[PDB]
Design a protein around this ligand. Structure first.
Ligand SMILES: *[C@@H]1O[C@H](CO)[C@@H](O)[C@H](O)[C@H]1NC(C)=O
Ligand SMILES: *[C@@H]1O[C@H](CO)[C@@H](O)[C@H](O)[C@H]1NC(C)=O
Ligand SMILES: *[C@@H]1O[C@H](CO)[C@@H](O)[C@H](O)[C@H]1NC(C)=O
Ligand SMILES: *[C@@H]1O[C@H](CO)[C@@H](O)[C@H](O)[C@H]1NC(C)=O
Ligand SMILES: *[C@@H]1O[C@H](CO)[C@@H](O)[C@H](O)[C@H]1NC(C)=O
Lengths: 302, 346, 250, 302
């Protein structure tokens, strides 16, 4: 039935509309050359501290040496030094030796340029736009069982489609799990993904890319661009033994290598599309200060 | 490069394993060999009798020396105009390979003047000299009437180090030289010169693809200077910056980026086509091969071959504070020398 | 054309008390050492291994405030409210919405220019429900934000941009045409005045007409931290009220 | 000479090529409707301080109230106030009042957010890069005496063109200044603008616009965007009384009404498009230190 039923049973000549290519269609029809990369797709929504510590010990040793020249800031010079690294200026001590004052001024210049470089490091980390992929391919262990992971999620396909036949010829257990999670409409699954009545969706690549390229806010982002996927192409289906095949293929390949196909891709595809959060670094802060008070409780044994 | 050296050798890889796969599919034997000279093949006149011929793999195919091209052949229009092509086993495009204080010293002389004028201001109108000197040590880096101008200078010192933080964050964070080319749509490459040296593989499909398009003709008159035989020679020529850019396919340059981390591609991507199998005219080895390739596409055997070769892969703050680090490490000797002075004076 | 800071505040309210307890356990003392901790997380303000924890806490002070310098750079510096359209190549006007109110003068040259171009048919569906009669009504409607775009010639829009600062145009420029003199049929005035117009183009009389009307036009840091400035100007009363409470204690 | 002589002597029927239009050319032949905007062109290479002063007076008055409350906190505490703005680690005063500690904590948070907003201010000032043109228009002070400014520079045109004739219609003395500064070629003048042999150049609009577009590195910069210029237009030269005039005019104005002319301008015209320098801020530094030594000379009377 369908497109294949109208082509093979000779109520039409060729199938110009958008149509996938698989094995039994290629048995019953003779396709043209492809013209757009349309596989399948799934839519969802080190060395500073050590040498600076050694230089800190060097500064403390020179402070001990200036005490050997000449009050009780022998071991208390570290509480001055690493306290004035950050320049919050905890009241610590006022040094007496001239070479100690020159050393503190040089180390304070180093601390000022260090905090300036750290602000530049935070700005450079603020430059980059990071992306996350909770599912990184069709062979995910999440797709194996929704009881394997703690939220039981869901994934959608389209009925009476070539994707279902590819799943049945490639992953029968995944077809058994998809049997629980069927639906009907493409825009129905779109509304279910926007409201939150659906978690994942399985279809072709460029259709979902165009649906992502025209949505406001752009919540729906794919997984890659067709790399762990079927990677086939859309073409034109004709009857077996038609003399139009060579001429249509030469016309299509002429339409490829001139940028006119790229002009039509510009005409019909769109290539468009945070806050204050550091709670991972904050949890690291709380855990390091808990480890520090644990170290103080260890040193309290004397 | 070869006076006379033709030997049997061991060959393997991506399309070799694809050949083993469809040899397993339907049963046949074969004879794997290579091209006489390393060209894909372009429609070119031989300059006797005014006659077009083909060379390379196509020239060995049409002459009966070859009967099946299991090789990365780029499908385009004119090569399909003469022989038949199967459906492509690899989909990719085209891309480009590339290789990826003084005024503060014036302010220091100014505060050398400022310390002297503040101490003379304290001297004129009423260990103290060394106390005001150490006050100047505490002011010029910031680790009662003269102290007014001193705290004015402290405001100067904070606004100078704020401008210093701002323009260092500028110089190494925000602004950037345009190391990227932005692909084929670079207007400077439209009329190139000796500073943008880029070309393609000699007699490849890139040559015909850039010979066809009328809005890329001028670059075609530039890239005809440095046409290279193999892609390895192109990697070698860009490796020592004898070139400046190179035009090649997607997955090959991605594999070379996984090989060498300096060989980096660019943003743009055009001419979406596919590597397929170079085939003869009407032959009984046409439908079987396309069906076997499509059977290899419907399962993950293409992704298994990606796992073999395609998918298979292989700040720290010491940049401008390296000289400052060396100066801090060298100033310890000057501090010890000042300790020698303080010993020798008393 | 905040909450994380509150969590840090409750955290340091825990930190100062537990560090004073830990400093007492490892040998007006309480209030003075709490004010010493106030000087630890802030600048100095006041005149043994527990101090080590304190100097560790000093490091966290920087990873507050440099982070406070970081996120505002993500909040005001690089980001921008998308109020630009960037000309005719915006797909927002190619695929319109109910709030994208763009129009022109009803039965103008823009309407025929978009009616001939069939690829601009979709915008032709919009303005027929939205067009006005005079451009001054359009300026008055876009001042009240009843419009959202306005396809128009550049002279009037740049003049109103010189008038009002919020009236902002864009960069792209399509259908680069000319304003001339509408004439009748075959007549010598088609010739003479035309040379006179060219006599105006060769000299600086067009330049003087530009100087009369065309060419002649007509940080502070209070974006959202002015509420914090009002908080600084207003917390003095509550502070001195707490000082009167401290008088009532003494 | 050239094309116009071939049209007047009628060995050329029409001159469809690029051609400037002025008065005498419109006298001798007839032109078409314009199709491109081509004039001429020249190529070259408060209250915050008041409110912080008010808040400083507020802090000084509350310091007076601290000294009256419960030891030099009368007027010298401003040395604590405008010293803790900058975090210099200079000892000023140890406060003995709770009012002083709370007010200095508020002022310290205010100084932290002020320096953070000032870093944001420096970022926004650094993003705003200057783009100015020293020559305003044809009535420049440079265009009356180049030795009035300290370098006497030079600027040229093309020889024997319509631009020189329009300059001679504007000013014969401008032609007298330009007569010693003539040159031959277009790209010769371009290279003379590259290697410092020439400082400015005057020609038509779109030619120098395209040469600025193909300028390698955005080095040579135009002046203005078509404001203080001649503002003529290219046309199609036809013979006087030719019957093809109205048909060519209607065909051109049909060719404007579909964006095809804009497509050809997109194809053939592409007009594309950091260190330590703070000379405005350093000039403010020199002005404020001059004001500081002036205030010291005022205070020297006591
Ligand atoms: C799929 O095909 C069956 C054939 O009976 C039909 O009943 C069913 O509704 C179809 N589902 C859809 C919506 O594709
Ligand atoms: C393998 O070769 C044998 C002998 O020629 C033949 O009978 C058999 O059909 C072949 N297998 C297939 C199915 O190609
Ligand atoms: C053209 O003919 C000449 C004849 O000597 C010969 O060199 C060769 O066949 C052609 N040119 C080349 C490729 O050298
Ligand atoms: C594959 O090969 C066999 C070889 O005879 C041939 O019948 C046909 O081309 C293919 N298989 C089918 C459909 O029989
Ligand atoms: C301009 O109008 C005058 C009116 O007398 C006429 O002589 C002349 O033909 C017109 N212009 C020219 C020079 O053709």
């Amino acid at each position: 039935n369908g497109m294949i039923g109208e082509v093979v049973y000779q109520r039409a000549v060729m199938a110009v509309g958008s149509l996938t290519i698989n094995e039994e269609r290629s048995e019953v029809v003779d396709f043209s050359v492809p013209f757009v990369e349309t596989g399948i797709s799934v839519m969802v929504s080190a060395s500073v501290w050590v040498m600076m510590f050694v230089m800190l010990l060097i500064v403390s040793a020179i402070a001990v040496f200036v005490f050997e020249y000449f009050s009780f800031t022998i071991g208390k010079a570290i509480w001055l030094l690493w306290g004035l690294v950050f320049n919050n200026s905890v009241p610590v001590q006022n040094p007496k030796g001239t070479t100690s004052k020159i050393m503190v001024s040089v180390w304070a210049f180093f601390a000022v340029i260090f905090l300036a470089s750290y602000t530049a490091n935070l700005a450079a980390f603020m430059i980059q736009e990071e992306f996350v992929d909770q599912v990184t391919g069709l062979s995910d262990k999440k797709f194996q069982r929704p009881h394997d992971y703690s939220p039981p999620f869901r994934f959608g396909t389209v009925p009476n489609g070539s994707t279902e036949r590819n799943i049945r010829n490639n992953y029968p257990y995944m077809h058994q799990y998809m049997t629980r999670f069927n639906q009907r409409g493409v825009e129905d699954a779109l509304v279910s993904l926007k409201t939150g009545k659906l978690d994942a969706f399985i279809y072709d690549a460029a259709v979902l890319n165009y649906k992502a390229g025209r949505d406001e806010g752009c919540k729906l982002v794919t997984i890659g661009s067709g790399y762990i996927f079927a990677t086939t192409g859309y073409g034109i289906a004709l009857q077996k033994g038609s003399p139009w095949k060579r001429q249509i293929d030469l016309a299509l390949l002429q339409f490829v290598g001139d940028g006119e196909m790229e002009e039509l891709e510009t005409l019909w595809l769109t290539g468009i599309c945070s806050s204050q959060l550091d709670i991972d670094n904050m949890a690291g802060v709380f855990y390091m200060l808990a480890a520090a008070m644990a170290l103080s409780l260890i040193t309290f044994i004397w | 490069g070869s006076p006379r050296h033709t030997v049997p050798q061991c060959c393997y890889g991506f399309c070799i394993d694809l050949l083993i796969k469809l040899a397993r599919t339907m049963n046949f034997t074969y004879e794997v060999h290579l091209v006489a000279d390393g060209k894909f093949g372009t429609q070119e006149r031989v300059n006797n009798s005014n006659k077009k011929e083909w060379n390379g793999m196509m020239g060995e195919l049409l002459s009966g020396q070859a009967d099946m091209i299991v090789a990365p052949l780029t499908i385009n229009n004119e090569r399909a105009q003469y022989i038949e092509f199967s459906k492509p086993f690899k989909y990719q495009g085209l891309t480009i390979l590339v290789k990826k204080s003084t005024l503060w010293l014036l302010v220091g002389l100014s505060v050398h003047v400022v310390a002297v004028m503040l101490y003379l201001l304290d001297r004129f109108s009423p260990l103290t000299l060394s106390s005001a000197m150490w006050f100047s040590w505490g002011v010029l880096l910031n680790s009662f009437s003269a102290r007014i101008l001193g705290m004015v200078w402290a405001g100067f010192a904070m606004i100078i180090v704020a401008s210093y933080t701002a323009n260092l964050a500028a110089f190494l964070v925000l602004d950037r030289p345009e190391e990227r080319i932005t692909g084929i749509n670079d207007p400077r490459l439209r009329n190139p010169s000796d500073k943008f040296i880029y070309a393609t593989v000699k007699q490849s499909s890139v040559d015909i693809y850039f010979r066809r398009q009328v809005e890329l003709s001028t670059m075609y008159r530039h890239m005809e200077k440095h046409n290279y035989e193999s892609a390895a020679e192109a990697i070698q020529a860009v490796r020592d910056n004898k070139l400046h850019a190179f035009i090649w396919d997607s997955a090959v340059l991605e594999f070379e980026a996984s090989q060498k981390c300096d060989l980096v591609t660019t943003g743009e991507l055009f001419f979406r086509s596919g590597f397929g199998i170079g085939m003869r005219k009407d032959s009984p080895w046409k439908q079987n091969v396309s069906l076997s390739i499509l059977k290899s596409h419907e399962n993950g055997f293409m992704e298994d071959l990606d796992k073999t070769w395609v998918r298979y892969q292989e700040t720290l703050t010491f940049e401008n504070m390296a000289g400052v680090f060396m100066l801090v490490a060298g100033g310890i000797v000057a501090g010890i020398f000042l300790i020698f002075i303080e010993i020798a004076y008393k | 054309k905040s909450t994380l800071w509150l969590l840090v505040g409750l955290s340091v309210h825990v930190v100062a008390v537990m560090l004073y307890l830990l400093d007492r356990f490892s040998p007006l003392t309480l209030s003075s050492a709490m004010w010493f901790s106030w000087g630890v997380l802030l600048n100095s303000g006041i005149g043994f291994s527990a101090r080590i924890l304190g100097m560790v806490w000093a490091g966290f002070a920087m990873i507050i405030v440099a982070s406070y310098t970081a996120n505002l750079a993500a909040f005001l510096v690089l980001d921008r409210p998308e109020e630009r359209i960037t000309g005719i190549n915006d797909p927002r006007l190619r695929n319109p919405s109910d709030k994208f109110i763009y129009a022109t003068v009803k039965q103008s040259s823009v309407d025929i220019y978009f009616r001939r171009q069939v690829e601009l048919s979709t915008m032709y569906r919009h303005m027929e429900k939205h067009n006005y009669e005079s451009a001054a009504e359009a300026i008055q409607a876009v001042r009240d934000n009843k419009l959202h775009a306005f396809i128009w010639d550049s002279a009037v829009l740049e003049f109103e941009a010189s008038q009002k600062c919020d009236l902002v145009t864009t960069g792209e420029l399509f259908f680069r045409s000319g304003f001339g003199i509408g004439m009748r049929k075959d007549s010598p005035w088609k010739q003479n005045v035309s040379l006179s117009i060219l006599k105006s183009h060769e000299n600086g009389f067009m330049e003087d007409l530009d100087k009369t009307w065309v060419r002649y036009q007509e940080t502070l840091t209070f974006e959202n931290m002015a509420g914090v400035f009002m908080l600084v100007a207003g917390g003095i009363v509550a502070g001195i009220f707490l000082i009167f409470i401290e008088i009532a204690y003494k | 000479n050239g094309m116009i002589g071939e049209v007047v002597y009628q060995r050329a029927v029409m001159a469809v090529g690029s051609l400037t239009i002025n008065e005498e050319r419109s006298e001798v032949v007839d032109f078409s409707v314009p199709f491109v905007e081509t004039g001429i062109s020249v190529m070259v290479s408060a209250s915050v301080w008041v409110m912080m002063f008010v808040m400083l007076l507020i802090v000084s008055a509350i310091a007076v109230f601290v000294f009256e409350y419960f030891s030099f906190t009368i007027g010298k505490a401003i040395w604590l106030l405008w010293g803790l703005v900058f975090n210099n680690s200079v000892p000023v005063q140890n406060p003995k009042g709770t009012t002083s500690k709370i007010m200095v904590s508020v002022w310290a948070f205010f100084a932290v957010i002020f320096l953070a907003s000032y870093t944001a201010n420096l970022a926004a000032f650094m993003i705003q890069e200057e783009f100015v043109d020293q020559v305003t228009g044809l009535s420049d002070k440079k265009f009356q005496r180049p030795h009035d400014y300290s370098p006497p520079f030079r600027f040229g045109t093309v020889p024997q063109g319509s631009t020189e004739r329009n300059i001679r219609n504007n000013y014969p003395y401008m032609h007298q200044y330009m007569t010693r500064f003539n040159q031959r070629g277009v790209e010769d003048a371009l290279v003379s603008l590259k290697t410092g042999k020439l400082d400015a150049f005057i020609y038509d609009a779109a030619v120098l616009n395209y040469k600025a577009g193909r300028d390698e590195g955005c080095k040579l910069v135009t002046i203005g965007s078509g404001y203080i210029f001649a503002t003529t237009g290219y046309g199609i030269a036809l013979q006087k009384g030719s019957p093809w005039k109205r048909q060519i005019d209607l065909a051109l104005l049909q060719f404007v009404g579909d964006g095809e002319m804009e497509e050809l301008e997109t194809l053939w015209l592409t007009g594309i498009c950091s260190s330590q320098l703070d000379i405005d801020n350093m000039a403010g530094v020199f002005y404020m230190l001059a004001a500081a030594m002036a205030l010291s000379l005022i205070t020297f009377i006591w």
